[PDB]
Amino acid sequence: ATQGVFTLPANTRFGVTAFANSSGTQTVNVLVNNETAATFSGQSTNNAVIGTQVLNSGSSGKVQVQVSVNGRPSDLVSAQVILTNELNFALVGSEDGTDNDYNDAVVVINWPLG
Amino acid sequence: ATQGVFTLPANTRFGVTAFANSSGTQTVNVLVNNETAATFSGQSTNNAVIGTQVLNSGSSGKVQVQVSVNGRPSDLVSAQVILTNELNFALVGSEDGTDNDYNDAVVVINWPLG
Ligand SMILES: *C(=O)C[C@@H]1O[C@@H](C)[C@@H](O)[C@@H](O)[C@@H]1O
Ligand SMILES: *C(=O)C[C@@H]1O[C@@H](C)[C@@H](O)[C@@H](O)[C@@H]1O
Ligand SMILES: [Ca+2]
Ligand SMILES: [Ca+2]
Ligand SMILES: [Ca+2]
Ligand SMILES: [Ca+2]
């Protein structure tokens, strides 16, 4: 099934943050309305933040997260969680190798802000 | 019900990251084995990271997140979500006022690392 695609409320500010836990350099692309709005790149095996950004969901609200390592797309896992019917989380995990820990690039999207 | 308390695997490294979305300074306390392991403090209305760190779940694996503003404890919402039976997220939201957006301090715990 398709992973890493989330439908946010339109024209809403959201935060996106990426962590790295891999020997390979992780590249995270954040797509809004099917067009690249942010790109994070970095390497770390200690959960270092390779990028954090505030974006706008745009007119369609469609937000897609893509992860790649040296041009090869990573396998993604994703889910959305809503707490007390207000606080939203869009979580993405990714695997670039064989150990299947799916933390090589961890992307957290949270909204609302402010 | 009790919120902000998660049972992690024992002696396991985990990342903890806090965001701020409020006019008040957020004080986030991360407890391990009922003892304060880390304290984040900052103010932001644009989802700025007021703290990110790698900690150890300890001999019991008990991790508690506490949030307070000007000494007054905030109301917490929390849940844990596991993706592909391996990737773990512990999420915390907090409310310091009356608008009930529960993003004033957002804490995300993720494991495993590396
Ligand atoms: C090799 O590059 C694979 C890779 O890096 C390891 C340090 C570990 O994080 C593994 O999960 C990751 O896929
Ligand atoms: C005011 O101090 C309350 C406070 O700050 C606002 C800017 C908004 O973020 C609100 O949710 C927060 O509780
Ligand atoms: Ca991996
Ligand atoms: Ca890894
Ligand atoms: Ca609030
Ligand atoms: Ca707020």
Numbering used by the authors:
A (entry chain B), B (entry chain A): 1 to 114
Reproduce, without paraphrasing, sentences from the article in which this PDB structure was first reported.
Herein we report the first X-ray crystal structures of mixed chirality α-helices in short peptides comprising only natural residues as the example of a stapled bicyclic and a linear membrane disruptive amphiphilic antimicrobial peptide (AMP) containing seven l- and four d-residues, as complexes of fucosylated analogs with the bacterial lectin LecB. The mixed chirality α-helices are superimposable onto the homochiral α-helices and form under similar conditions as shown by CD spectra and MD simulations but non-hemolytic and resistant to proteolysis. To get a direct insight into the structure of AMBP bp65/bp69 and their linear analogs ln65/ln69, we performed several crystallization studies using either the compounds themselves or their racemates to be crystallized as pure compounds, or their fucosylated derivatives of both mirror image peptides as complexes with the P. aeruginosa lectin LecB. While previous reports of similar mixed chirality AMPs concluded on either unordered conformations or helical conformations appearing in a membrane environment based on deconvolution of FTIR spectra, here we reported X-ray crystallographic evidence of short mixed chirality helices consisting of only natural residues existing as helix bundles within the protein environment of a lectin and almost perfectly superimposable with their parent homochiral α-helices. These direct observations unequivocally demonstrate that the α-helical fold with only natural residues can sometimes tolerate multiple stereochemical inversions without significant conformational changes.
The same was true across the ten different X-ray structures of linear α-helices observed in the X-ray structures of LecB complexes for the homochiral Fln65 and its mixed chirality analog Fdln69 (RMSD < 0.9 Å). This comparison showed that the helical geometries of the homochiral and heterochiral helices were not significantly different from each other. A similar α-helical fold was observed for the corresponding linear mixed chirality peptide ln69 and the homochiral sequence ln65. Surprisingly, the mixed chirality sequences bp69 and ln69 showed similar CD spectra and an even stronger α-helical signal as their homochiral parents in 5 mM DPC although they contained 7 l- and 4 d-residues (ESI†). To test whether the α-helix was stabilized by the bicyclic staple, we repeated the MD simulation with linear analogs ln65 and ln69, which again showed rapid unfolding in water but refolding to a stable α-helix at the DPC micelle surface for both the homochiral linear peptide ln65 and the mixed chirality linear peptide ln69. The mixed chirality linear AMP ln69 showed comparably strong antibacterial activities but reduced hemolysis and much stronger stability against serum proteolysis compared to its homochiral parent ln65, similar to previous reports with mixed chirality AMPs.
